What we know:
Number of helices of chain E: 0
Distance between the termini of chain B: 84 Å
Helix content of chain B: under 10%
Function (chain G): This is one of the proteins that bind and probably mediate the attachment of the 5S RNA into the large ribosomal subunit, where it forms part of the central protuberance.
Oligomer: part of a larger assembly
Strand order of the largest sheet of chain E: 2-1-4-3
Structural class of chain B: mainly beta
Order of helices and strands of chain E: EEEE
Organism (chain E): Thermus thermophilus (strain ATCC 27634 / DSM 579 / HB8)
Strand order of the largest sheet of chain B: 2-1-3
Order of helices and strands of chain B: EEE
Number of strands of chain E: 4
Distance between the termini of chain E: 13 Å
Strand content of chain E: over 45%
GO molecular function (chain E): rRNA binding; structural constituent of ribosome; tRNA binding
Largest interface: A-B, 26 and 24 residues
Shape of chain B: rod-shaped
Shape of chain E: elongated
Subunit structure (chain E): Part of the 50S ribosomal subunit.
Radius of gyration of chain E: 11 Å
Number of helices of chain B: 0
Bound molecules: magnesium ion, zinc ion
Protein name (chain E): Large ribosomal subunit protein bL33
Number of strands of chain B: 3
Largest sheet of chain B: 3 strands, mixed
Amino acid sequence: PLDVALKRKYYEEVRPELIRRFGYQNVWEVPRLEKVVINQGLGEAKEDARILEKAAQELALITGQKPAVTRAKKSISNFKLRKGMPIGLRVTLRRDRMWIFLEKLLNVALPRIRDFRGLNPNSFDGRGNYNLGLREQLIFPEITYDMVDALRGMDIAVVTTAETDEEARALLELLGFPFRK
Amino acid sequence: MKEGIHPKLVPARIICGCGNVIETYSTKPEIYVEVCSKCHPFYTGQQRFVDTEGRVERFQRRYGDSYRK
Amino acid sequence: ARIAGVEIPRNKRVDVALTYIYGIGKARAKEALEKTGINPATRVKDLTEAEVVRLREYVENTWKLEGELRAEVAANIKRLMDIGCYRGLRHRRGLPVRGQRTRTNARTRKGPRKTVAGKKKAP
Amino acid sequence: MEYRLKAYYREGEKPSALRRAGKLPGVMYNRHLNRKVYVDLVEFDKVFRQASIHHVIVLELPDGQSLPTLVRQVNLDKRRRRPEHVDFFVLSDEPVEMYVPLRFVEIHRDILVKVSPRNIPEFIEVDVIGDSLHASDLKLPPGVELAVSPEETI
Amino acid sequence: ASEVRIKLLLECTECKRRNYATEKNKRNTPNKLELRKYCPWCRKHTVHREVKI
Amino acid sequence: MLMPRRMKYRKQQRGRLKGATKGGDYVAFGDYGLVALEPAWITAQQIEAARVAMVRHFRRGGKIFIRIFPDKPYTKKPLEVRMGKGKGNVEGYVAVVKPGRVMFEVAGVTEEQAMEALRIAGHKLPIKTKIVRRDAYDEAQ
Amino acid sequence: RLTAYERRKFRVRNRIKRTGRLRLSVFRSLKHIYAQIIDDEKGVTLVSASSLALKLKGNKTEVARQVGRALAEKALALGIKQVAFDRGPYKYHGRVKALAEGAREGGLEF
RNA sequence: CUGACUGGGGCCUGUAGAGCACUGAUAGGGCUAGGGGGCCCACCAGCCUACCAAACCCUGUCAAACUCCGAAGGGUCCCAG
RNA sequence: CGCCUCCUAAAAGGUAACGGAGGCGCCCAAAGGUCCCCUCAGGCGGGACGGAAAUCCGCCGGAGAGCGCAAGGGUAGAAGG
RNA sequence: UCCCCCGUGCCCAUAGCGGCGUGGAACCACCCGUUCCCAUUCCGAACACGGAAGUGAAACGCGCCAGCGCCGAUGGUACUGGGCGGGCGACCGCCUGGGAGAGUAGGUCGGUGCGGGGGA
Lengths: 181, 69, 123, 154, 53, 141, 110
Ligand SMILES: [Mg+2]
Ligand SMILES: [Mg+2]
Ligand SMILES: [Mg+2]
Ligand SMILES: [Mg+2]
Ligand SMILES: [Mg+2]
Ligand SMILES: [Mg+2]
Ligand SMILES: [Mg+2]
Ligand SMILES: [Mg+2]
Ligand SMILES: [Mg+2]
Ligand SMILES: [Mg+2]
Ligand SMILES: [Mg+2]
Ligand SMILES: [Mg+2]
Ligand SMILES: [Mg+2]
Ligand SMILES: [Mg+2]
Ligand SMILES: [Mg+2]
Ligand SMILES: [Mg+2]
Ligand SMILES: [Mg+2]
Ligand SMILES: [Mg+2]
Ligand SMILES: [Mg+2]
Ligand SMILES: [Mg+2]
Ligand SMILES: [Mg+2]
Ligand SMILES: [Mg+2]
Ligand SMILES: [Mg+2]
Ligand SMILES: [Mg+2]
Ligand SMILES: [Mg+2]
Ligand SMILES: [Mg+2]
Ligand SMILES: [Mg+2]
Ligand SMILES: [Mg+2]
Ligand SMILES: [Mg+2]
Ligand SMILES: [Mg+2]
Ligand SMILES: [Mg+2]
Ligand SMILES: [Mg+2]
Ligand SMILES: [Mg+2]
Ligand SMILES: [Mg+2]
Ligand SMILES: [Mg+2]
Ligand SMILES: [Mg+2]
Ligand SMILES: [Mg+2]
Ligand SMILES: [Mg+2]
Ligand SMILES: [Mg+2]
Ligand SMILES: [Mg+2]
Ligand SMILES: [Mg+2]
Ligand SMILES: [Mg+2]
Ligand SMILES: [Mg+2]
Ligand SMILES: [Mg+2]
Ligand SMILES: [Mg+2]
Ligand SMILES: [Mg+2]
Ligand SMILES: [Mg+2]
Ligand SMILES: [Mg+2]
Ligand SMILES: [Mg+2]
Ligand SMILES: [Mg+2]
Ligand SMILES: [Mg+2]
Ligand SMILES: [Mg+2]
Ligand SMILES: [Mg+2]
Ligand SMILES: [Mg+2]
Ligand SMILES: [Mg+2]
Ligand SMILES: [Mg+2]
Ligand SMILES: [Mg+2]
Ligand SMILES: [Mg+2]
Ligand SMILES: [Mg+2]
Ligand SMILES: [Mg+2]
Ligand SMILES: [Mg+2]
Ligand SMILES: [Mg+2]
Ligand SMILES: [Mg+2]
Ligand SMILES: [Mg+2]
Ligand SMILES: [Mg+2]
Ligand SMILES: [Mg+2]
Ligand SMILES: [Mg+2]
Ligand SMILES: [Mg+2]
Ligand SMILES: [Mg+2]
Ligand SMILES: [Mg+2]
Ligand SMILES: [Mg+2]
Ligand SMILES: [Mg+2]
Ligand SMILES: [Mg+2]
Ligand SMILES: [Mg+2]
Ligand SMILES: [Mg+2]
Ligand SMILES: [Mg+2]
Ligand SMILES: [Mg+2]
Ligand SMILES: [Mg+2]
Ligand SMILES: [Zn+2]
Ligand SMILES: [Zn+2]
């Protein structure tokens, strides 16, 4: 594997601090990142522009990973939704590509967020995972105003080996997640 | 990883307005950014910008105790 | 999002382009360019990134803008309501706040005419 | 407590015969023993109407034993409203679950409790539209365990 | 069967005998059916084409 | 008066009245009860007549428990028709009541008041009844 | 609650057992590979072979092919000829596939 | 000599009775999302509810087209009279 | 007025009435064969637009989902995807 | 023969859920990698391959605990084949043989076959 600044920071700075804060007896007991899952809820592409490969390609640019499609589990009259319609894009980031994406996210993406004043301390899984939602995709460094047809937001799942909210918070905090409270 | 469908991640350098430089990996070799972690007001100390005000009001008004005694 | 949080329009002059930011009228445009030493007549497309960051750095630090200004405006109105003065009461019902007549007009605050039946006449 | 009641043994004597001659068929048992018994109905009726399932009844067996029991089960005859069968639960040192009456100083006349037989109480005091209490908050005189769920409404 | 769901014959492309009867939905499947089928005359599998019944 | 809010089936076959009641044979709630001595289909209007009798005796005091519910559809053909041509229309609801069943219970009223009330109630029913008091036998079930 | 692992194991084995052949079952650990030929009617194992028992080390696939040959050698000797290959939870690939190849190479019929 | 009927033995079953785990019905009480109503209030939320509201719990019940259960019998084969 | 499902039907099969309830007169070239892989509904918690319900994450969840259409039987150790 | 681990069956919850505890020499898992075979409607998560620094944290195995789940008598009763009576009926009773369900006592934190590896 390769050297990424955030990854190294996890092993030499974050891991020792966590043992200090919580006192694990086993080197595996200590929290890890499992995977990061990104989802473009979409469905604006249910009928109109029935294929938005644009969102896939631009999502592919940010992660380095081509997203797979998600199709409607059931038909829903009110949402003008027929079962099996392509209504989302999901990409699962693991290992290096997870670190690289989290690294730019913390370093440049979140700061680019409009009127950004920290993340939500309350958005923790209860089971030691975290989720955050973005409304603009131009927030990422490799996406610009020139290349975009329309604003698309996303949902981000950060999944940790931590059992509890308290442990996962310390991890994400120590890694560089900026929280409002 | 699957051949043909993914975009290559290469060594890349992201540059901020504050002169900050970030060594990372991207689809683009060089990228220039308006803001970053190193200089963002919320991140840097508490760089309270233009607003020290809190808020002020109302009876910072003073000016003064001139009405007589 | 070039500056401040917004992308000011290329192919127009800087002094005009800056105005497209919430919180910069033409007056603050002239003064910012003077204070940072950039030509007011140069198209946004034609600015050195040196000019860009210099102009950018100034503008964001000198004045509170966009969201922050909107928030500060919002807090002010909110304050008037909560105390709550006559001024605050007017904001509650969305009527004029500065002493205008409401028997007619006031459409900007009140909105579109909700026409209603009048009083019938005899036969 | 406490009450005493004569009891006798049976084998192949028909239940219908016993009942026709004024006797209540029964069984007494615990972890160690199980015996087919019968008691005199009119006598049993005198005791049970005060003893119920709350208080100890001592069976004076014909063989001289005086065994400490709780009434665990009384099978009624639905048509006539008369007892058909009695289950005498033989007490020993081990803790037993039982029902203990409640005196209000009402959805529950009594409460289910896991108490040692040596320590069996006779009272539990409860201090007093539509306000009520939930067994959890109860008196609990030493050697006594709530054998319900504290959620339960009294 | 119905108007949309028609009956049809399968004709061996080589020796031209009809060997099979079956059905299709000519709205769903407007193309003439082509299926490999054992032809009893040719004593081998052959492409069979849909033919009007 | 009482009837099922909704039903899976509109009409039920008549069936039988063999045996003592399945359950409901012991005092569950109140202090005094009325127990059936004979099997019958007790009607909704009969149940309501007995209840309101009890209610009037109490001058709205006390508490009344009704431990039977009329969920059996009662069907009858229109007058002066002939046999056949399908089952008659549902015209009411009944509760199957067998000997030993505690139909009603009362509480929060004096013994003299319960006895008389339960007696008046019995007179509204098409069967012989008995008045009972809560016993250790009841509380033991 | 069953895992996809168990379902897969149950599914291919159930299909295998119906044929009624002797069952050449194969277990594959991170280090080793094991094979035992089984009479499911008697619930008895007739012949076994494994990398651990033969004390082989090296290329896991090459080891697999060898334990396969080993199994067959003992197999034909006991009169055993036909068998049904039980890949269980494993794809028919690689180590498992090499072992099967070895058993066939050895003279087993399947 | 195979028969009706009978002894022994194996297998098949879902009724009588019962039960409430499923589908529904259902009495009283507790705990409770959507409120009804409520004095408030709408600047933005709160609190009671001697009432109508899922699920859950406790007490208590009902069912041809309900069954976690489940007889006596019945059927069929074998051996025997 | 023929055919299918349930009950009536009295625990084998069969069993009637102008008895109680429904459905069929189609459909599918994949909704067929085989190989390989996969596991539901629902509940709580988390998440931009986003709602009771779209898609995403976690925990629980043996089958209450699904299997073109009535009902019954069957069924995830698949007949479902 | 006895103890442990690895496969694989059988009985089909007395085997389950939860709460504890315990195990890495061996075995197994996670693990280290993703060159190679193979793989992802994206992802070396899974499937697969090459490995052996580390940890038994997860998983799995093995113990404990009866809160739940599961099992569950004896006694009595319902019902009933067969034989008899009673009631205007709805329905009730006796004889003989059979005999539940619910509930009570209580029981269970599995049992065992074959093969392999290790140990006494
Ligand atoms: Mg450590
Ligand atoms: Mg939270
Ligand atoms: Mg976690
Ligand atoms: Mg950008
Ligand atoms: Mg890479
Ligand atoms: Mg402006
Ligand atoms: Mg005015
Ligand atoms: Mg005496
Ligand atoms: Mg009595
Ligand atoms: Mg008496
Ligand atoms: Mg008890
Ligand atoms: Mg044909
Ligand atoms: Mg067709
Ligand atoms: Mg053919
Ligand atoms: Mg011919
Ligand atoms: Mg044709
Ligand atoms: Mg009739
Ligand atoms: Mg009548
Ligand atoms: Mg009728
Ligand atoms: Mg008729
Ligand atoms: Mg009628
Ligand atoms: Mg009754
Ligand atoms: Mg009367
Ligand atoms: Mg009396
Ligand atoms: Mg070798
Ligand atoms: Mg191998
Ligand atoms: Mg196998
Ligand atoms: Mg003969
Ligand atoms: Mg014969
Ligand atoms: Mg016989
Ligand atoms: Mg016979
Ligand atoms: Mg019945
Ligand atoms: Mg029920
Ligand atoms: Mg019933
Ligand atoms: Mg009935
Ligand atoms: Mg039934
Ligand atoms: Mg049972
Ligand atoms: Mg029969
Ligand atoms: Mg027979
Ligand atoms: Mg027989
Ligand atoms: Mg003979
Ligand atoms: Mg039948
Ligand atoms: Mg026949
Ligand atoms: Mg089909
Ligand atoms: Mg296929
Ligand atoms: Mg939610
Ligand atoms: Mg949108
Ligand atoms: Mg289903
Ligand atoms: Mg339909
Ligand atoms: Mg094992
Ligand atoms: Mg065996
Ligand atoms: Mg433990
Ligand atoms: Mg340990
Ligand atoms: Mg463990
Ligand atoms: Mg080790
Ligand atoms: Mg070690
Ligand atoms: Mg490669
Ligand atoms: Mg462990
Ligand atoms: Mg227990
Ligand atoms: Mg517990
Ligand atoms: Mg039992
Ligand atoms: Mg018995
Ligand atoms: Mg009899
Ligand atoms: Mg008889
Ligand atoms: Mg008898
Ligand atoms: Mg008998
Ligand atoms: Mg018996
Ligand atoms: Mg029993
Ligand atoms: Mg009962
Ligand atoms: Mg008993
Ligand atoms: Mg034990
Ligand atoms: Mg257990
Ligand atoms: Mg075992
Ligand atoms: Mg053990
Ligand atoms: Mg075993
Ligand atoms: Mg052994
Ligand atoms: Mg050995
Ligand atoms: Mg040895
Ligand atoms: Zn910066
Ligand atoms: Zn031909």
